[PDB]
Design a protein around this motif. Structure first.
Motif, PDB file in Angstrom:
ATOM      1  N   UNK A  35       0.858  -1.187   0.000  1.00  0.00           N
ATOM      2  CA  UNK A  35       0.000   0.000   0.000  1.00  0.00           C
ATOM      3  C   UNK A  35       0.893   1.235   0.000  1.00  0.00           C
ATOM      4  N   UNK A  86      -7.183  -3.231  -1.388  1.00  0.00           N
ATOM      5  CA  UNK A  86      -7.972  -3.447  -0.172  1.00  0.00           C
ATOM      6  C   UNK A  86      -8.797  -2.234   0.240  1.00  0.00           C
ATOM      7  N   UNK A  87      -8.600  -1.074  -0.389  1.00  0.00           N
ATOM      8  CA  UNK A  87      -9.385   0.107  -0.046  1.00  0.00           C
ATOM      9  C   UNK A  87     -10.440   0.350  -1.125  1.00  0.00           C
ATOM     10  N   UNK A  88     -10.894   1.593  -1.230  1.00  0.00           N
ATOM     11  CA  UNK A  88     -11.876   1.925  -2.235  1.00  0.00           C
ATOM     12  C   UNK A  88     -11.308   2.128  -3.618  1.00  0.00           C
ATOM     13  N   UNK A  89      -9.986   2.286  -3.739  1.00  0.00           N
ATOM     14  CA  UNK A  89      -9.372   2.696  -4.997  1.00  0.00           C
ATOM     15  C   UNK A  89      -7.990   2.078  -5.125  1.00  0.00           C
TER      16      UNK A  89
ATOM     17  N   UNK B 474     -11.804   2.338   6.429  1.00  0.00           N
ATOM     18  CA  UNK B 474     -11.714   2.368   4.971  1.00  0.00           C
ATOM     19  C   UNK B 474     -11.422   1.003   4.369  1.00  0.00           C
ATOM     20  N   UNK B 475     -11.310  -0.030   5.192  1.00  0.00           N
ATOM     21  CA  UNK B 475     -11.161  -1.403   4.726  1.00  0.00           C
ATOM     22  C   UNK B 475     -12.199  -2.255   5.433  1.00  0.00           C
ATOM     23  N   UNK B 476     -12.743  -3.243   4.722  1.00  0.00           N
ATOM     24  CA  UNK B 476     -13.667  -4.189   5.332  1.00  0.00           C
ATOM     25  C   UNK B 476     -12.994  -4.916   6.497  1.00  0.00           C
ATOM     26  N   UNK B 498     -16.688   3.431   5.880  1.00  0.00           N
ATOM     27  CA  UNK B 498     -16.526   4.064   4.585  1.00  0.00           C
ATOM     28  C   UNK B 498     -16.657   3.089   3.423  1.00  0.00           C
ATOM     29  N   UNK B 499     -16.827   1.797   3.691  1.00  0.00           N
ATOM     30  CA  UNK B 499     -17.067   0.784   2.674  1.00  0.00           C
ATOM     31  C   UNK B 499     -18.517   0.319   2.725  1.00  0.00           C
TER      32      UNK B 499
END
Ligand code: CA
Ligand code: CA
Lengths: 726, 726
Positions: A35, A86-89, B474-476, B498-499
């Motif tokens: 990351x 693993x994040x949104x993007x 921000x991560x599951x 946030x997910x």
């Protein structure tokens, strides 16, 4: 100065030391679960760079991603593959909502099939925040899951008025998603669509971007979308929300591929000039040219009336549909106003100008548009006809032979960007699918575990040729490659399943059965067997299933023995059945109705059954379901011709009480079938003006087709006639 | 001769050379993917043995299994774990249908959680064929998937009249399956249930075998099930099919655990004598003592009338239900005949003898049964009452003090086998569940993936203690262990997802939330978000979810935002909500209705909501569904008391139009709730005589409960009264 680093911790230490003008160099190799937070402050004259030692040899894999934060940064020469963020993007021009990147550039990075394992676990691959960023000469291919590939966010004023530049990128093939949310590029969001973004999108190549109806979804103000090429892309450039945009110098090569659009005009003050459109076959919202109806007093995320559109000097060659006031209905009742369409060129060899008006169009003034003489004009004032013959210039575009006719349509100085002038020279542009039978032929023989072993050691694209005899199958045949199973001589290879499933289709599996014979007599004595199915793990990827010249019998040792059972959230690019026989089945034939949460998701793009025979099936031939009110897709298409169906659909466990139940299917064609002593056909038509044709059938001892319109009269074009009832 | 072997190829060589009296010895270590075929031929005096070098240090893992074939074989000292069989059975007393094992022994082998990855991919762990085989001093625990743990097969004459012996085994805990097919031991099947097996099942210990209503499923003739102990097992010893069986000297310690049975009598010529039953709470087919009605002229797999049963000298202490003619309905209309119940002792401190007759019981003659005087008798002739004080002998069993009364009930000479006299000394008998809060407490601080990090590095049973502040996620959060998440100070730890998912429950995940506050305002603006959910990959085992003193708000950024979403084929041992608040949620609260194929499968054993507050929920509080006509299970149970529900269930996407939609739930209790301006409770009652209590509620602006009966009118005890309706 150059700062070579070989570990994430060495990266951390180099980043701490890096000064304007320095390059942080990721050493060649595979960086797994990395990351990357690239947070630094370069200089207008001296940026801080993060780059791969040798572009094409630095891979970021597993749960890797990249965040830029600060200003005057450059990132280049990386490949994301064999993983997913693993994040949104995957790539974000921010650390988080309060710490953005500006004046920064991502160039020459590849993202190749870096998809989440579940199609409907949503992410995005590139998200731009801040101001004055650039995303250029990148290569993005193979996003399979929900979520736009690339978006510009506008969530605060710090990210509005950005003047971001998105140029020379290769947007490679993106397969059909199977719902809304498969855009390649989205500029803004409905919440922020009244803000001015000033984003520049130029000289990109969109190669088979097929996620959904919107290839590009413009959702903000005063952007410039120019000089892009759209090659065989199953969608449109949609001016979705937001006003005052310029769509100019773009080139669309449809090549006659199904469902290729299109510029779609919605909202105010749009300028659509000097665009070239060829061989586009789409219709409704996926038309080659679409001017939509809007909603009076529309909510911010619905549809705003077209007002002061300007459509000039576009060339439209063999564009099958030009649709004005498209979407007109009781909600979208605001027809286009104060608009102008001038100096366009329409050449069509199909006998028509392709134009359809769906409402009053007197709010569009037409002037000086030129049509070829063989094309019946749908509109009189503002279109003149002439003897036009087109010839292709060196720039690859068609122009009238006559110089005087070149004042209509597109300028001669256009120079479409080429596929090899975009992306990176060091990463190949490749074909996304394996073709059936593109491999080698393997002879297989009877008779125990011999099919399990042949499947397991075959290579993708191979063809297994079964010699005559008996194939007993004690272990599930799980397919994770493209494979054809072919009988050397039709009806001479008999396959005996002994498990609850014969064939399971996993990620990367695609299956053709040709001439095989399946007797399921020896399947386990249990309810709920499934002869063929996808994996029940949510899949990452679509699949293809072709069934030809085959026979399937005696799926009846216990109840609910289905022939094909689609996994939840699975998606078949097509299921095709030709010249095949099915007899004695207690379950359904095709179970394509798993997505009952009505989010617009569905299980199959094209279902085709022709020249086939089905007898003594307790369940339905097909249950296919697409629920909700989404208008972002084109399927399912259900086409059934020249079949004979006997004693179908009447089992007490078939809750549909139908031989065929079709909910939300967009194209329905049932032709020249016999439905003998069977449950009826049932249509449950939804939004999007679906097209249904049921003609030439015999319904003997079978009730007439049932039509339930869930949106009276929203409304479908439904032709059910020319059928013999009893 | 000893044949020490270190590889499968060495084993193969050793097997060829083994002579009667030799021992093939697998060397200590881990043998992964080892499909052992132990096929040899000893003599009565010199068997051929296969054994681990050091019992407890030889492990078969991965896709390993064992097949015995031939005669006079012994297999001992092996551990199957960390894997599952690739065939239908882990251990099979045959090579295949035609080549069986006789005079062979499997002893001191352990199978520890060797379950298929998917609960409803069926297998079995031990299959016995042939004759004169022995299965003793083994240790079987943790089978999770459909399929009986161990069965005796009778498929041909060669496996009938076997005199197989099954003794001194530890049948360890087996979790609830959630459908039929979770038996610990099956003797025969329906098709062969009229043949004689002569199987001896003695001195085994059944420790919380909770797979389904049948711990033991006797399905053949003239078997002997004697001297076994059933400790807190959620099920029964059923004489399911087949006649002439003896059930003798067995001990049942229910300890008041829920749904503990029971001996269930069906079919002809059964003898039930000298069994001790204490503290059993089950009812209907899971009663402490059941004599069923049968089906006149029954199909072979249905229910055969009880004819010539003999029930004598059994002791029943605090057994809440003794039921005669159980299951009586229009199909099961054949009451017991030619039967006798003599010299039993019933001692019950609940006010009653616990007897219920569901039909004519004149086919049962009673004589010389003794009941304590405080317990109101249901039957007069054949019963007398007296002053009884029970005292517990050294064998752990209660006996009347007055010597004259010891002619009623069980013999004083019974010696129940102990848990530590069974199985193997070298392998521990463990608790199957990690208990919440059994590990250490871990402090966690705000706020950027601190929760993600603390979860990853915690160990099973730990408690995370959240300090005050904000927890951005921000991560599951993936849960693959037992874990508690507790606020240090109820209300000061705020969690911001946030997910689209906050918490995902994977295999081995079990979750307690205590004092947390979740504000979902910042979740993705997308429909179909799910705050908490299982994984959507088909799970291997059940999970537990406890929510206490917690607040969940603003799950409303888009539509269909669910609090909790069950995956397909997932199963919660329980979901318990206490003293918690839920507000502004567009989706459903608990989606437990995924198994719509009506095979009797369901998603939750116990759903409990008490003392909690739900306000502004568009969807249903709970949708829980169990379909079909199965009678092999006890759940779901749905219990909701002392809650306040305001504005629940009236959302336009809630197709149920219910605040609660309960189909096939077997125990329903809604008491002292407020339903204010909400959609109604809706019951869809199925088979199995479900029990429903809805009393003491306020329905203000809410329609009163709706009762739909699928099977009018074959039972169902529905008490809806004492509610206020305004
Ligand atoms: Ca879209
Ligand atoms: Ca059972």
């Amino acid at each position: 100065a150059d700062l070579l680093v070989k570990t994430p911790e060495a990266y951390d230490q180099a980043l701490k030391k890096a000064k304007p003008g320095d390059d942080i160099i990721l050493a060649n190799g595979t960086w797994r679960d990395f990351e990357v937070l690239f947070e630094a402050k370069g200089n207008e004259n001296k940026p801080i760079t993060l780059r791969g030692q040798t572009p094409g040899k630095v891979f970021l894999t597993g749960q890797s991603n990249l965040r830029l934060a600060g200003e005057h940064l450059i990132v280049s020469g990386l490949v994301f593959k064999d993983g997913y963020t693993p994040t949104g993007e995957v790539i974000a021009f921010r650390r988080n909502k309060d710490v953005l990147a500006s004046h920064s550039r991502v160039t020459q990075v590849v993202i190749d099939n870096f998809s989440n394992p579940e199609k409907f676990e949503q992410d995005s691959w590139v998200m731009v925040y801040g101001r004055h960023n650039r995303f250029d000469h990148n290569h993005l291919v193979g996003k399979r899951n929900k979520g736009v590939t690339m978006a510009v966010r506008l969530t605060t004023e710090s990210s509005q008025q950005n003047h971001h530049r998105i140029d020379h990128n290769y947007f490679g093939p993106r397969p059909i998603l199977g719902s809304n949310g498969g855009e390649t590029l989205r500029i803004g969001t409905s919440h922020h669509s009244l803000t001015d973004s000033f984003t520049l999108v130029e000289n990109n190549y969109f190669d088979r971007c097929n996620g959904e109806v919107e290839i590009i979804s413009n959702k903000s103000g005063k952007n410039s979308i120019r000089n892009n090429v759209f090659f065989e892309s199953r969608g449109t450039l949609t001016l979705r929300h937001g006003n005052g945009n310029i769509v100019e110098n773009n080139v669309f090569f449809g090549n006659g591929v199904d469902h290729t659009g299109g510029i779609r005009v919605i909202n105010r003050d749009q300028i659509i000039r000097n665009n070239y459109l060829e061989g586009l076959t789409g219709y409704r919202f996926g038309s080659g040219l679409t001017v939509m109806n809007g909603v009076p007093n529309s909510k911010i995320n619905r549809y705003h009336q077209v007002d002061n559109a300007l459509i000039e000097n576009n060339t439209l060659v063999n564009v099958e549909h030009i649709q004005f006031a498209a979407g007109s209905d009781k909600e979208r009742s605001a027809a286009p106003i104060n608009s102008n369409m001038n100096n366009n060129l329409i050449v069509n060899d199909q006998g028509t100008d392709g134009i359809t008006a769906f409402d009053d169009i007197s709010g569009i003034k037409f002037k000086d548009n030129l049509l070829n003489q063989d094309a019946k004009p749908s509109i009189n004032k503002g279109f003149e006809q002439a003897d036009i013959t087109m010839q292709r210039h060196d720039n690859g575009l068609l122009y009238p032979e006559a110089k005087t006719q070149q004042k209509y349509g597109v300028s001669t100085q256009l120079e479409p960007i080429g596929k090899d002038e975009v992306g990176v020279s060091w990463y190949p542009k490749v074909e996304p699918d394996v073709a059936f039978g593109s491999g080698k032929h393997i002879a297989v023989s009877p008779g125990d575990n011999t099919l399990f072993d042949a499947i397991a050691s075959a290579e993708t694209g191979d063809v297994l040729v079964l010699q005559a005899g008996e194939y007993w199958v004690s272990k599930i045949l799980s397919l994770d490659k493209t494979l054809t199973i072919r009988a050397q001589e039709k009806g001479s290879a008999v396959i005996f399943p002994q498990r609850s499933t014969l064939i399971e289709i996993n990620n990367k599996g695609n299956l053709t059965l040709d001439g095989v014979y399946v007797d399921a007599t020896n399947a386990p004595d249990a309810a709920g067997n499934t002869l063929i199915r996808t994996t029940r793990l949510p899949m990452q990827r679509n699949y293809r299933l072709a069934i030809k010249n085959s026979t399937f019998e005696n799926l009846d040792i216990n109840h609910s023995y289905h022939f094909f059972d689609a996994g939840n959230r699975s998606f078949a690019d097509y299921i095709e059945v030709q010249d095949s026989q099915f007899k004695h089945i207690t379950g359904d034939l095709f179970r394509l109705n798993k997505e009952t949460d009505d989010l617009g998701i569905y299980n199959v793009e094209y279902l085709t059954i022709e020249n086939s025979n089905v007898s003594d099936l307790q369940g339905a031939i097909a249950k296919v379901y697409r629920g909700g009110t989404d208008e972002s897709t084109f399927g399912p298409h259900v086409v059934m011709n020249n079949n004979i169906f006997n004693e179908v659909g009447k089992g007490k466990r078939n809750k549909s009480a139908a031989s065929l139940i079709l909910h939300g299917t967009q194209v329905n064609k049932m032709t020249t079938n016999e439905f003998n002593n069977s449950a009826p056909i049932i249509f449950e038509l939804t939004v999007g003006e679906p097209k249904t044709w049921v003609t030439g059938n015999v319904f003997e001892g079978t009730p007439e087709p049932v039509v339930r319109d869930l949106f009276p009269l929203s409304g479908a074009t439904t032709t059910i006639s020319g059928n013999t009832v009893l």
